[PDB]
Amino acid sequence: NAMDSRFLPATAFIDPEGRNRNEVERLVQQVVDLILAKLTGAAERPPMPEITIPEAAATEATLLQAIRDMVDGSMNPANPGYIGHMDPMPATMAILGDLVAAAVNNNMLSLEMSPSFSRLETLLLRAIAGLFGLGEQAGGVLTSGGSLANLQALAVARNVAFDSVEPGITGLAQRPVIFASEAAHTSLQKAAMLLGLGTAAVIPVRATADSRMDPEDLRARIDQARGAGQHPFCVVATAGTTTTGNIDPLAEIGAIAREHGLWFHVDAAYGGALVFSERHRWRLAGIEQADSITFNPQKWLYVAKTCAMVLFRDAGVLERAFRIPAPNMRATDGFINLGEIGVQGTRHADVVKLWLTLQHIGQQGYARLIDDGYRLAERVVEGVRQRPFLRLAGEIDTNIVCFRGEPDWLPAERWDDWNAALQALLLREGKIFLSLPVYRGGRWLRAVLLNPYTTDAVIDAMFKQIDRFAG
Amino acid sequence: RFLPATAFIDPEGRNRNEVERLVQQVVDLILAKLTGAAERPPMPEPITIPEAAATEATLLQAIRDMVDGSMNPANPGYIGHMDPMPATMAILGDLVAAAVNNNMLSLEMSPSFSRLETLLLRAIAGLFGLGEQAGGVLTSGGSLANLQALAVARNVAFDSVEPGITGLAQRPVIFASEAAHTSLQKAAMLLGLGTAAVIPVRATADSRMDPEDLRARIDQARGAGQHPFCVVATAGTTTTGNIDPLAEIGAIAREHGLWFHVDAAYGGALVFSERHRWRLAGIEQADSITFNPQKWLYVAKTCAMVLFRDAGVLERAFRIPAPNMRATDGFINLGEIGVQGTRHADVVKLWLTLQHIGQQGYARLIDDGYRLAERVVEGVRQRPFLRLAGEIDTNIVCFRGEPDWLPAERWDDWNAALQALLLREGKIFLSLPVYRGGRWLRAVLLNPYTTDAVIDAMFKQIDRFAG
């Protein structure tokens, strides 16, 4: 009983027989109090902030100070001025869900290690799949981020195309390739690299002025690849591109993919949230035919990171073309160890925050949040339209507006400096955070209007600052 | 159509009271469950997304149901898996992480966390003896850690980052103990190697890789026109908790010019123990190490890392082509050098836990595990109907009934029956892995509240079942 020893602090663990209850409760309460103070007081911190392992147990005071230092030095999307990333303030229940998940400390790896969570996740994901219109065989798993979801979808596409689970892909005569919009996520190059495809395997497809993949170009690239002696196996349409928030023409892309016998993956990491909005979900038309979908509740569903999933129209594909040889060990109620069918083995129980958050907000709540996001975005667009020195990236499909100064008082070569300077000013003096992505070979301002506490006033304040900066 | 007042925390305090109450209710509920964990056995005895916001009572009930329906490693009888009750600071660390909701993807999205993680991992790497250039990243589990190490080994060997590996004439292969983790197979499949790319090396009766076999397998693969690029030693095998002879394996790998990866997912914890870290000797020479604080460091899942002896390797042989945007203080966006992009700030729970427990605490915890393990071993030795899988290297004991009153064909049935009985009657959870073509009982002596009495109780039950 180390917990009785002088080598462990009394509160290192929670005594299961209640013997350290009071001490634990104190320590827990201190953190809780501190955290709530920080969150309820989040508008007091700017959107962006301005090591040895000890021999002996640290004091409560050191621990608390560390937490305080951690919170203070962190980015603060809770601030209404934080309008620059698809990284939102977490829903309250998401924060609580993680507390619960950590407390129980179950493992998604297997049913015996997560007997409730595993079942809940499977069922919930089936439900979500239904929202996407995927059909009766549809299913999936939660993954620790979108990248892993894309990686898994691609891994399945690859395995299905090449029968690679046991022999791998080193044999291949024709290089396997995938097609994505030039605006698609970098996780597609990283995945390709991990998959043994190489980064070059991701063939960029021309996107329109509105940053939507051009189906004529996709068709052209597929033909070009075949001509090149490459073996196209997958097309990735993106619903809500990372930079500009645009949504690929999913129905057309899907059709092209289907025509060509290509796995159709839809990277709906951000845009997938629109399934909760009757008003906006038509934007996703064609998604229902996807072989797989990546969707990230951590983004537009406000679930504390990480919360992501990949859904397959046919979940059984995970068994056929992913899961490694091992004894079949399904429970009598029919569930499967999730680890067998995921990139991860051990995995945190994200389902708890997801389930809690979905219930608390509800479909109506999301529909509302989404509408407000669109409204804020439209405000930003109208504001850009009003100013000639400022240009939009293109039309918007989501609550994301990418724009930049293209001031005629400067050579184009100095536009990046101007935009960087403006972004710095907006942050330093505005206390408004916009990202400054590299886009189209240039530095562009980026607004993602997620914070539910962002207001028309914040937007107005932003444009007033921009106006002053620009004269 | 609307939102619950508490759906978010108002950053100007407008909902502070409601938020505080809701949080307090969950916190009180969780504490009750945890401080009361022994009252719940080690294992537990339509889903739609609603249109409208659920009530707080519904949510609280959902949490109760979820906890109740969950495995309970906190129970002292839970002695079956490398899945521990969480350290207190780990639970709290997750609460903190979730609240700030930073993203490990980039410095901009986690300015403290990124720096803290890099520095901490450098410290940990030093503990492993990796040297001045050593570093790593946290990953959402050991499997990812193994996957990343292998991806690097592959990229280094085959220059695969941009062109991939499909061109290859000679099949790339790696060697691992026949006892090694299935995440290598998965990883091999992910990496485009195929599961069959992991060539099993004979393990001894003690479930340790046999160096001579390793040498033999490498020669054989080369003979068969394969391209060996990595040897994986396992410091703490999943089933039996055995440690491969790391120095010997490492020497062999080096002799063969093979990347040496040590899967220390479990056994890596030993670095915290002055008494037992000699067990890892030779680990210091690894090219890469996988280590999972979520196992024997008691950090709530997930917490894992891959460390490289040369952190620079991640830039050379992993990171995708992208503009260079190191911060002025020299840090890099972690997303660029990890399998994951967006990632939860596991560093918070890790840092807090390590601080709270300390090296002394872990050393005690570890010693205590060996002591329980030793008790289990003693108990097995005392009973002729029970056999040990082999000698133990960690706080894990794999054993099974091999009763002479049954045909060997019925041994699996006997053990499954015993395990079911122990769980149902004794409230003691032993895992029943498949090992050596059979079902074996497995004990992981992790719970700090597992005692000698629990072990004695297990044996009395075993004796009763045996007759």
mmCIF file with all atom_site columns, N, CA and C in Angstrom, chain A residues 138-185:
data_model
loop_
_atom_site.group_PDB
_atom_site.id
_atom_site.type_symbol
_atom_site.label_atom_id
_atom_site.label_alt_id
_atom_site.label_comp_id
_atom_site.label_asym_id
_atom_site.label_entity_id
_atom_site.label_seq_id
_atom_site.pdbx_PDB_ins_code
_atom_site.Cartn_x
_atom_site.Cartn_y
_atom_site.Cartn_z
_atom_site.occupancy
_atom_site.B_iso_or_equiv
_atom_site.pdbx_formal_charge
_atom_site.auth_seq_id
_atom_site.auth_comp_id
_atom_site.auth_asym_id
_atom_site.auth_atom_id
_atom_site.pdbx_PDB_model_num
ATOM 1   N N  . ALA A 1 138 ? -24.531 1.622  -42.641 1.00 0.00 ? 138 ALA A N  1
ATOM 2   C CA . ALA A 1 138 ? -23.560 2.650  -42.293 1.00 0.00 ? 138 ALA A CA 1
ATOM 3   C C  . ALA A 1 138 ? -23.117 2.602  -40.827 1.00 0.00 ? 138 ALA A C  1
ATOM 4   N N  . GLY A 1 139 ? -21.901 3.044  -40.574 1.00 0.00 ? 139 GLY A N  1
ATOM 5   C CA . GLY A 1 139 ? -21.334 3.033  -39.245 1.00 0.00 ? 139 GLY A CA 1
ATOM 6   C C  . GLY A 1 139 ? -19.957 3.653  -39.257 1.00 0.00 ? 139 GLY A C  1
ATOM 7   N N  . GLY A 1 140 ? -19.339 3.691  -38.088 1.00 0.00 ? 140 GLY A N  1
ATOM 8   C CA . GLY A 1 140 ? -18.014 4.211  -37.973 1.00 0.00 ? 140 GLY A CA 1
ATOM 9   C C  . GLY A 1 140 ? -17.472 4.175  -36.576 1.00 0.00 ? 140 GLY A C  1
ATOM 10  N N  . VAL A 1 141 ? -16.364 4.875  -36.411 1.00 0.00 ? 141 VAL A N  1
ATOM 11  C CA . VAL A 1 141 ? -15.714 5.002  -35.148 1.00 0.00 ? 141 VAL A CA 1
ATOM 12  C C  . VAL A 1 141 ? -15.266 6.434  -34.919 1.00 0.00 ? 141 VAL A C  1
ATOM 13  N N  . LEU A 1 142 ? -15.181 6.806  -33.657 1.00 0.00 ? 142 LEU A N  1
ATOM 14  C CA . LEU A 1 142 ? -14.538 8.034  -33.241 1.00 0.00 ? 142 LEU A CA 1
ATOM 15  C C  . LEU A 1 142 ? -13.024 7.861  -33.382 1.00 0.00 ? 142 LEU A C  1
ATOM 16  N N  . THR A 1 143 ? -12.347 8.945  -33.698 1.00 0.00 ? 143 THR A N  1
ATOM 17  C CA . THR A 1 143 ? -10.913 8.974  -33.828 1.00 0.00 ? 143 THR A CA 1
ATOM 18  C C  . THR A 1 143 ? -10.393 10.233 -33.175 1.00 0.00 ? 143 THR A C  1
ATOM 19  N N  . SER A 1 144 ? -9.140  10.200 -32.773 1.00 0.00 ? 144 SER A N  1
ATOM 20  C CA . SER A 1 144 ? -8.545  11.344 -32.106 1.00 0.00 ? 144 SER A CA 1
ATOM 21  C C  . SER A 1 144 ? -8.082  12.365 -33.151 1.00 0.00 ? 144 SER A C  1
ATOM 22  N N  . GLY A 1 145 ? -9.064  13.087 -33.661 1.00 0.00 ? 145 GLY A N  1
ATOM 23  C CA . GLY A 1 145 ? -8.880  14.057 -34.710 1.00 0.00 ? 145 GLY A CA 1
ATOM 24  C C  . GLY A 1 145 ? -9.249  13.666 -36.133 1.00 0.00 ? 145 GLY A C  1
ATOM 25  N N  . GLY A 1 146 ? -9.487  14.673 -36.941 1.00 0.00 ? 146 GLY A N  1
ATOM 26  C CA . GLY A 1 146 ? -9.851  14.540 -38.332 1.00 0.00 ? 146 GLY A CA 1
ATOM 27  C C  . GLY A 1 146 ? -8.803  13.844 -39.179 1.00 0.00 ? 146 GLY A C  1
ATOM 28  N N  . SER A 1 147 ? -7.541  14.094 -38.863 1.00 0.00 ? 147 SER A N  1
ATOM 29  C CA . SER A 1 147 ? -6.455  13.560 -39.639 1.00 0.00 ? 147 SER A CA 1
ATOM 30  C C  . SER A 1 147 ? -6.510  12.043 -39.610 1.00 0.00 ? 147 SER A C  1
ATOM 31  N N  . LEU A 1 148 ? -6.736  11.487 -38.429 1.00 0.00 ? 148 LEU A N  1
ATOM 32  C CA . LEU A 1 148 ? -6.858  10.060 -38.260 1.00 0.00 ? 148 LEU A CA 1
ATOM 33  C C  . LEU A 1 148 ? -8.067  9.496  -38.984 1.00 0.00 ? 148 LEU A C  1
ATOM 34  N N  . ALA A 1 149 ? -9.150  10.262 -39.003 1.00 0.00 ? 149 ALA A N  1
ATOM 35  C CA . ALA A 1 149 ? -10.324 9.867  -39.734 1.00 0.00 ? 149 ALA A CA 1
ATOM 36  C C  . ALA A 1 149 ? -10.017 9.799  -41.222 1.00 0.00 ? 149 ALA A C  1
ATOM 37  N N  . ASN A 1 150 ? -9.367  10.815 -41.748 1.00 0.00 ? 150 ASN A N  1
ATOM 38  C CA . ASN A 1 150 ? -8.986  10.802 -43.142 1.00 0.00 ? 150 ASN A CA 1
ATOM 39  C C  . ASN A 1 150 ? -8.034  9.648  -43.405 1.00 0.00 ? 150 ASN A C  1
ATOM 40  N N  . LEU A 1 151 ? -7.097  9.452  -42.489 1.00 0.00 ? 151 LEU A N  1
ATOM 41  C CA . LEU A 1 151 ? -6.107  8.404  -42.634 1.00 0.00 ? 151 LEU A CA 1
ATOM 42  C C  . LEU A 1 151 ? -6.786  7.051  -42.710 1.00 0.00 ? 151 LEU A C  1
ATOM 43  N N  . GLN A 1 152 ? -7.742  6.799  -41.830 1.00 0.00 ? 152 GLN A N  1
ATOM 44  C CA . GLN A 1 152 ? -8.470  5.565  -41.863 1.00 0.00 ? 152 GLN A CA 1
ATOM 45  C C  . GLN A 1 152 ? -9.303  5.377  -43.139 1.00 0.00 ? 152 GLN A C  1
ATOM 46  N N  . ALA A 1 153 ? -9.980  6.419  -43.571 1.00 0.00 ? 153 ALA A N  1
ATOM 47  C CA . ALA A 1 153 ? -10.801 6.344  -44.773 1.00 0.00 ? 153 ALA A CA 1
ATOM 48  C C  . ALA A 1 153 ? -9.952  6.005  -45.993 1.00 0.00 ? 153 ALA A C  1
ATOM 49  N N  . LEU A 1 154 ? -8.844  6.694  -46.113 1.00 0.00 ? 154 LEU A N  1
ATOM 50  C CA . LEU A 1 154 ? -7.865  6.444  -47.142 1.00 0.00 ? 154 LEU A CA 1
ATOM 51  C C  . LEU A 1 154 ? -7.278  5.026  -46.985 1.00 0.00 ? 154 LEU A C  1
ATOM 52  N N  . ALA A 1 155 ? -7.037  4.597  -45.755 1.00 0.00 ? 155 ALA A N  1
ATOM 53  C CA . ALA A 1 155 ? -6.462  3.286  -45.554 1.00 0.00 ? 155 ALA A CA 1
ATOM 54  C C  . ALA A 1 155 ? -7.439  2.228  -46.093 1.00 0.00 ? 155 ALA A C  1
ATOM 55  N N  . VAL A 1 156 ? -8.723  2.384  -45.794 1.00 0.00 ? 156 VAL A N  1
ATOM 56  C CA . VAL A 1 156 ? -9.735  1.503  -46.311 1.00 0.00 ? 156 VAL A CA 1
ATOM 57  C C  . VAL A 1 156 ? -9.850  1.573  -47.839 1.00 0.00 ? 156 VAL A C  1
ATOM 58  N N  . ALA A 1 157 ? -9.804  2.769  -48.390 1.00 0.00 ? 157 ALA A N  1
ATOM 59  C CA . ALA A 1 157 ? -9.936  2.941  -49.818 1.00 0.00 ? 157 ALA A CA 1
ATOM 60  C C  . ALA A 1 157 ? -8.785  2.193  -50.466 1.00 0.00 ? 157 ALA A C  1
ATOM 61  N N  . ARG A 1 158 ? -7.600  2.367  -49.908 1.00 0.00 ? 158 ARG A N  1
ATOM 62  C CA . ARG A 1 158 ? -6.398  1.740  -50.403 1.00 0.00 ? 158 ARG A CA 1
ATOM 63  C C  . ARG A 1 158 ? -6.496  0.220  -50.300 1.00 0.00 ? 158 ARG A C  1
ATOM 64  N N  . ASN A 1 159 ? -6.942  -0.291 -49.155 1.00 0.00 ? 159 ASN A N  1
ATOM 65  C CA . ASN A 1 159 ? -7.065  -1.715 -48.946 1.00 0.00 ? 159 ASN A CA 1
ATOM 66  C C  . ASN A 1 159 ? -8.086  -2.355 -49.864 1.00 0.00 ? 159 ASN A C  1
ATOM 67  N N  . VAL A 1 160 ? -9.189  -1.669 -50.060 1.00 0.00 ? 160 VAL A N  1
ATOM 68  C CA . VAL A 1 160 ? -10.195 -2.125 -50.965 1.00 0.00 ? 160 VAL A CA 1
ATOM 69  C C  . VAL A 1 160 ? -9.669  -2.140 -52.397 1.00 0.00 ? 160 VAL A C  1
ATOM 70  N N  . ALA A 1 161 ? -8.999  -1.087 -52.818 1.00 0.00 ? 161 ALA A N  1
ATOM 71  C CA . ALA A 1 161 ? -8.447  -1.052 -54.153 1.00 0.00 ? 161 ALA A CA 1
ATOM 72  C C  . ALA A 1 161 ? -7.362  -2.126 -54.403 1.00 0.00 ? 161 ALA A C  1
ATOM 73  N N  . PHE A 1 162 ? -6.481  -2.325 -53.425 1.00 0.00 ? 162 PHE A N  1
ATOM 74  C CA . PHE A 1 162 ? -5.269  -3.096 -53.613 1.00 0.00 ? 162 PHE A CA 1
ATOM 75  C C  . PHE A 1 162 ? -5.092  -4.360 -52.793 1.00 0.00 ? 162 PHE A C  1
ATOM 76  N N  . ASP A 1 163 ? -6.065  -4.700 -51.980 1.00 0.00 ? 163 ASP A N  1
ATOM 77  C CA . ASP A 1 163 ? -5.979  -5.899 -51.176 1.00 0.00 ? 163 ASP A CA 1
ATOM 78  C C  . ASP A 1 163 ? -4.728  -5.941 -50.311 1.00 0.00 ? 163 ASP A C  1
ATOM 79  N N  . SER A 1 164 ? -4.403  -4.814 -49.723 1.00 0.00 ? 164 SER A N  1
ATOM 80  C CA . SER A 1 164 ? -3.113  -4.594 -49.123 1.00 0.00 ? 164 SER A CA 1
ATOM 81  C C  . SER A 1 164 ? -2.985  -4.967 -47.646 1.00 0.00 ? 164 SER A C  1
ATOM 82  N N  . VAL A 1 165 ? -4.043  -5.463 -47.015 1.00 0.00 ? 165 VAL A N  1
ATOM 83  C CA . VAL A 1 165 ? -4.003  -5.595 -45.570 1.00 0.00 ? 165 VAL A CA 1
ATOM 84  C C  . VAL A 1 165 ? -2.845  -6.510 -45.146 1.00 0.00 ? 165 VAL A C  1
ATOM 85  N N  . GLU A 1 166 ? -2.730  -7.672 -45.767 1.00 0.00 ? 166 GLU A N  1
ATOM 86  C CA . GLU A 1 166 ? -1.668  -8.592 -45.431 1.00 0.00 ? 166 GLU A CA 1
ATOM 87  C C  . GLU A 1 166 ? -0.370  -8.414 -46.212 1.00 0.00 ? 166 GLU A C  1
ATOM 88  N N  . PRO A 1 167 ? -0.430  -8.214 -47.528 1.00 0.00 ? 167 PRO A N  1
ATOM 89  C CA . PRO A 1 167 ? 0.786   -8.039 -48.343 1.00 0.00 ? 167 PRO A CA 1
ATOM 90  C C  . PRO A 1 167 ? 1.291   -6.670 -48.513 1.00 0.00 ? 167 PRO A C  1
ATOM 91  N N  . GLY A 1 168 ? 0.500   -5.694 -48.137 1.00 0.00 ? 168 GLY A N  1
ATOM 92  C CA . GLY A 1 168 ? 0.916   -4.338 -48.298 1.00 0.00 ? 168 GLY A CA 1
ATOM 93  C C  . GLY A 1 168 ? 0.866   -3.846 -49.738 1.00 0.00 ? 168 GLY A C  1
ATOM 94  N N  . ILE A 1 169 ? 1.515   -2.721 -49.999 1.00 0.00 ? 169 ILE A N  1
ATOM 95  C CA . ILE A 1 169 ? 1.503   -2.122 -51.321 1.00 0.00 ? 169 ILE A CA 1
ATOM 96  C C  . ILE A 1 169 ? 2.825   -2.010 -52.045 1.00 0.00 ? 169 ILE A C  1
ATOM 97  N N  . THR A 1 170 ? 3.879   -2.608 -51.528 1.00 0.00 ? 170 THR A N  1
ATOM 98  C CA . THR A 1 170 ? 5.180   -2.467 -52.149 1.00 0.00 ? 170 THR A CA 1
ATOM 99  C C  . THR A 1 170 ? 5.250   -3.104 -53.538 1.00 0.00 ? 170 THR A C  1
ATOM 100 N N  . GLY A 1 171 ? 4.427   -4.099 -53.788 1.00 0.00 ? 171 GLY A N  1
ATOM 101 C CA . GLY A 1 171 ? 4.448   -4.777 -55.076 1.00 0.00 ? 171 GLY A CA 1
ATOM 102 C C  . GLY A 1 171 ? 4.050   -3.945 -56.284 1.00 0.00 ? 171 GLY A C  1
ATOM 103 N N  . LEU A 1 172 ? 3.246   -2.920 -56.051 1.00 0.00 ? 172 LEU A N  1
ATOM 104 C CA . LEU A 1 172 ? 2.499   -2.299 -57.112 1.00 0.00 ? 172 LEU A CA 1
ATOM 105 C C  . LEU A 1 172 ? 3.341   -1.730 -58.225 1.00 0.00 ? 172 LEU A C  1
ATOM 106 N N  . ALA A 1 173 ? 2.964   -2.061 -59.444 1.00 0.00 ? 173 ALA A N  1
ATOM 107 C CA . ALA A 1 173 ? 3.468   -1.461 -60.674 1.00 0.00 ? 173 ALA A CA 1
ATOM 108 C C  . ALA A 1 173 ? 3.012   -0.028 -60.950 1.00 0.00 ? 173 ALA A C  1
ATOM 109 N N  . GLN A 1 174 ? 1.751   0.241  -60.658 1.00 0.00 ? 174 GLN A N  1
ATOM 110 C CA . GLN A 1 174 ? 1.168   1.531  -60.943 1.00 0.00 ? 174 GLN A CA 1
ATOM 111 C C  . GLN A 1 174 ? 1.012   2.301  -59.628 1.00 0.00 ? 174 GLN A C  1
ATOM 112 N N  . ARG A 1 175 ? 1.523   3.502  -59.548 1.00 0.00 ? 175 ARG A N  1
ATOM 113 C CA . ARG A 1 175 ? 1.441   4.251  -58.340 1.00 0.00 ? 175 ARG A CA 1
ATOM 114 C C  . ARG A 1 175 ? -0.032  4.630  -57.976 1.00 0.00 ? 175 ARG A C  1
ATOM 115 N N  . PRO A 1 176 ? -0.498  4.237  -56.790 1.00 0.00 ? 176 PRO A N  1
ATOM 116 C CA . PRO A 1 176 ? -1.848  4.611  -56.363 1.00 0.00 ? 176 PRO A CA 1
ATOM 117 C C  . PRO A 1 176 ? -1.892  6.089  -56.100 1.00 0.00 ? 176 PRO A C  1
ATOM 118 N N  . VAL A 1 177 ? -2.949  6.729  -56.525 1.00 0.00 ? 177 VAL A N  1
ATOM 119 C CA . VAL A 1 177 ? -3.122  8.154  -56.330 1.00 0.00 ? 177 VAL A CA 1
ATOM 120 C C  . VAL A 1 177 ? -4.562  8.493  -55.941 1.00 0.00 ? 177 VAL A C  1
ATOM 121 N N  . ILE A 1 178 ? -4.727  9.641  -55.326 1.00 0.00 ? 178 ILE A N  1
ATOM 122 C CA . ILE A 1 178 ? -6.002  10.112 -54.885 1.00 0.00 ? 178 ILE A CA 1
ATOM 123 C C  . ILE A 1 178 ? -6.128  11.518 -55.414 1.00 0.00 ? 178 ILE A C  1
ATOM 124 N N  . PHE A 1 179 ? -7.350  11.989 -55.516 1.00 0.00 ? 179 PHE A N  1
ATOM 125 C CA . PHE A 1 179 ? -7.590  13.320 -55.980 1.00 0.00 ? 179 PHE A CA 1
ATOM 126 C C  . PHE A 1 179 ? -8.262  14.137 -54.896 1.00 0.00 ? 179 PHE A C  1
ATOM 127 N N  . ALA A 1 180 ? -7.757  15.340 -54.692 1.00 0.00 ? 180 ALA A N  1
ATOM 128 C CA . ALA A 1 180 ? -8.370  16.302 -53.801 1.00 0.00 ? 180 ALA A CA 1
ATOM 129 C C  . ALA A 1 180 ? -8.315  17.723 -54.342 1.00 0.00 ? 180 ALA A C  1
ATOM 130 N N  . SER A 1 181 ? -9.228  18.559 -53.876 1.00 0.00 ? 181 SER A N  1
ATOM 131 C CA . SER A 1 181 ? -9.174  19.947 -54.238 1.00 0.00 ? 181 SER A CA 1
ATOM 132 C C  . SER A 1 181 ? -7.853  20.517 -53.758 1.00 0.00 ? 181 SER A C  1
ATOM 133 N N  . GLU A 1 182 ? -7.374  21.511 -54.484 1.00 0.00 ? 182 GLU A N  1
ATOM 134 C CA . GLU A 1 182 ? -6.153  22.229 -54.136 1.00 0.00 ? 182 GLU A CA 1
ATOM 135 C C  . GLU A 1 182 ? -6.352  22.920 -52.792 1.00 0.00 ? 182 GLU A C  1
ATOM 136 N N  . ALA A 1 183 ? -7.608  23.090 -52.427 1.00 0.00 ? 183 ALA A N  1
ATOM 137 C CA . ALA A 1 183 ? -7.979  23.660 -51.157 1.00 0.00 ? 183 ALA A CA 1
ATOM 138 C C  . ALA A 1 183 ? -8.173  22.625 -50.040 1.00 0.00 ? 183 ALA A C  1
ATOM 139 N N  . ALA A 1 184 ? -8.032  21.337 -50.337 1.00 0.00 ? 184 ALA A N  1
ATOM 140 C CA . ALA A 1 184 ? -8.257  20.272 -49.361 1.00 0.00 ? 184 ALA A CA 1
ATOM 141 C C  . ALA A 1 184 ? -7.193  20.214 -48.257 1.00 0.00 ? 184 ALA A C  1
ATOM 142 N N  . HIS A 1 185 ? -7.554  19.553 -47.182 1.00 0.00 ? 185 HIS A N  1
ATOM 143 C CA . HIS A 1 185 ? -6.740  19.535 -46.005 1.00 0.00 ? 185 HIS A CA 1
ATOM 144 C C  . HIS A 1 185 ? -5.383  18.855 -46.192 1.00 0.00 ? 185 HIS A C  1
#
